[PDB]
Structures are given as structure tokens and as C-alpha cells.
Amino acid sequence: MAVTLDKDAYYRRVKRLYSNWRKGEDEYANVDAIVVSVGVDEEIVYAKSTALQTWLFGYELTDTIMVFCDDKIIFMASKKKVEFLKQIANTKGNENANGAPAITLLIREKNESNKSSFDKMIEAIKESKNGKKIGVFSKDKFPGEFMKSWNDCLNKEGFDKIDISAVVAYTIAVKEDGELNLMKKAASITSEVFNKFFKERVMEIVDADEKVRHSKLAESVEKAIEEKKYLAGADPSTVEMCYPPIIQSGGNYNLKFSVVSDKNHMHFGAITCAMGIRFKSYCSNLVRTLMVDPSQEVQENYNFLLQLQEELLKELRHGVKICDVYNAVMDVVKKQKPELLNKITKNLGFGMGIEFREGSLVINSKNQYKLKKGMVFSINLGFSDLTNKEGKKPEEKTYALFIGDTVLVDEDGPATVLTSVKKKVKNVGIFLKN
Secondary structure (H helix, E strand, O other): OOOOOOHHHHHHHHHHHHHHHHHOOHHHOOOOEEEEEEOOOOOOOOOHHHHHHHHHHOOOOOOEEEEEEOOOEEEEEOHHHHHHHHHHHOOOOOHHHOOOOOEEEEEOOOOOOOHHHHHHHHHHHHOOOOOOEEEEOOOOOOOOHHHHHHHHHHHOOOOEEEEOHHHHHHHHHOOOHHHHHHHHHHHHHHHHHHHHHHHHHHHHHHHHOOOOEHHHHHHHHHHHOOOHHHOOOOOHHHEEEOOOOEEEEOOEOOOOOOOOOOOOEOOOOEEEEEEOEEEOOEOOOEEEEEEEOOOHHHHHHHHHHHHHHHHHHHHOEOOOEHHHHHHHHHHHHHHHOHHHOOOEOOOOEEEOOOOOOOHHHEOOOOOOOEOOOOOEEEEEEEEEEEEOOOOOOHHHHEEEEEEEEEEEOEOOOOOEEOOOOOOOHHHHEEOOOO
């Protein structure tokens, strides 16, 4: 009945963390200890601290402190969580633990003070190499008295703090085969929900001439993932939304994933639809634009968007710098449709895994990181503020086109698409015929 911890996975991945840290590239340089603290998780935002726990343990743990030193690791948590972590702390006789620093478990006290435990972790940092600089996820600030008491104690030492979010994201980016199977299923579930529920519902609304608010349609998609018939064999208890589904139309667009569906009635023109399923903690992503009776001009821009995504897939391969992929795509726009340069999304996708969007792995003009086989990306491209020459009402005047898929980076060459939703005009057009 107790929660099972994948021990081999922990030993494998903690060794990988230490091998990258030891290499000392970028912000890993001169880091004496890595300090990760999780307080109460109000959620709302994905976080490196809890993502790291998912990667190492398979589960997130609130009010938990993790101190990785050169020659030892300390975890401090409640008695329940300590019992859980004993699965990896007690090596038993597992030779897979040979390469990993020994774990010390400290039991947190709701009452009776934790100063003795805090001091042990501080002394451990002090004794780790130079004992001066700690790697942190500076963005992660959690509420709670316990976290406040730990960070107050830690701050009295005046350690140098360096944010290691980017190097850690790169450390875990390449997916193991078991992780890829989870992301493949996540992508398949997203596709099933869209193919079997989302697209059908939109077509029913148009065919019936119904007035449905984007927010209501989004709620219906959320309700749909509670039903087994839409989950392609997966159990409803293993799936959640990566973010609330986003439907936009009628001239009111914003081609990103950090906004919610508005209260406006869906307009029957260009309907951008974004959704993603998180399966057993691994994210997927999909974006499709459904076009009602699209004109020649709309189809020409949309088919050019498909062409751009195809070029992106061809360039998204092992060893290539992310900014070089970005420039290759923008060069096609410059060469073929200069007038769309100021219309195209400034970002063309991002690394995706336990966390939905890796901020350090965004496909933009600046990113210097090199791609690797085994990385998984959400590849998204869109055109905003496009004009319908035949539009008469404001909601008909402007439209947008947005497409998005989950893809697996390969070596020599083109990336593999993991989502399975047809996107030719005949598959995404909502035609009078139906």
C-alpha cells in the first residue's frame, strides 16, 4: 500500500545530475552545493524545485529540503516522507547505488524546533569543497513558516547564490526511453481528445449556429478528459490538463499558452484551439486552427504556415543550435512572404517534459543551446493580425493562424511528430458541406 519509489531511476538520475555538475559548465562552475527547498505548493505555476523531485523520486514532496553536497546528500521532511525516502537512503545491497553519494534523512518537527537539523545541513554545505556558493532555483519562493525558518537560517550564512535553472533544465532535457513512452502516450491522449471530442464539438456548434462562450467550450474539454472513451485506453486518474484549454476567435487572439479562454461567443471564422494533456506528470501540447469556409487567401497563408513547420521539423535535429533553427525558418519567411515577418510569432516552440515550458529552451533568436536526440519539444508557429479583405464586421476583419505539435528530436535528421491530428485544410476546415 505504501508508495513505491523507482530506486534504479533515482540512482541513475542522481548520478547524471552529479556528472553534469562535476563537468562544471556555465552556472555549474564553482557551485559547492545544490540547495532545493519546497514549501506549500499552491501550484498555479510549474516549478524547477518540484520538477526535480518528480525526476529524482517520481513524486513531489512539500515542506521538503534537499541539500546535494560534494560527498553527501541530506533530505529533510516529515516522518511520512522520510519513510518514503528510506527506499533510496537504505542502499540495502543495491550496487546501482555505488555511484551515488550517501543519503542522510532528517525528520522535520511540526513543533519542538528544527535548529538542530538546519545546522546539520548548513555544516554539510560548509564542508562541501569551498563551502561558499550554492546553486538554487531563485524563482522558487514558497509560503509557509517552515520554509521561512529554513531560508532565514540559511541566509545568516551569506552564501553566494547562483541560479542553476538553465543548466539543470539542460541536464534533464534528454529523455530516457521510459520517459519517452510517457510523453508519447500523453501526446496520443491529447490527439484522441481533440480528434474525438474537441473538433466534433466545434463542428456541432457551427452546424447548429449555437452561441457558445470560449470559456464554456474550454470547460467542456476539461470535462471530456474525465471520460475513458476519450483517453485512448488511459485511466482518468492518470491525466490532467497542462493548462486550461485555450480557444480564441473573432479578432481577439493572443498566440501563447499563458492566457485563459475569454467569455466571448465563438465566432465562425478562424478558431485557434490549444490544449495539452499531462500524463503521469509528463506534458504534451497541440495547437490547431479550425477555419470556417476559408477563402483562397486564408488557405494560402495557412498552407504556408504548414510549410514553415515542415522546414522547422527538418532543421530541429541533434547538434544544431536553437537560434540556428529559428533563423532558418525566418529566412523562408523573408524569402517567400516578407509581408508576414511582422505577423509571425517571435517564438517557434520550446522544450517540454515534466515542466510544460522550459524557459531556457525556447526556440528564439537568442538561444545558444544545442539540440540533442531524445529531447522533446512543443513546436508552435502562428501568424497574428492578418486581414480578411472581405470582412465587414470587426470580428470578421482580423484573423490569426496557429499550429502546434509535440515532436521528438532525432539525429540525421528530421524530428518525429508525436501528436496525431491531421492538419491539412480538408481536415481542419469547417465546411458548409460537413
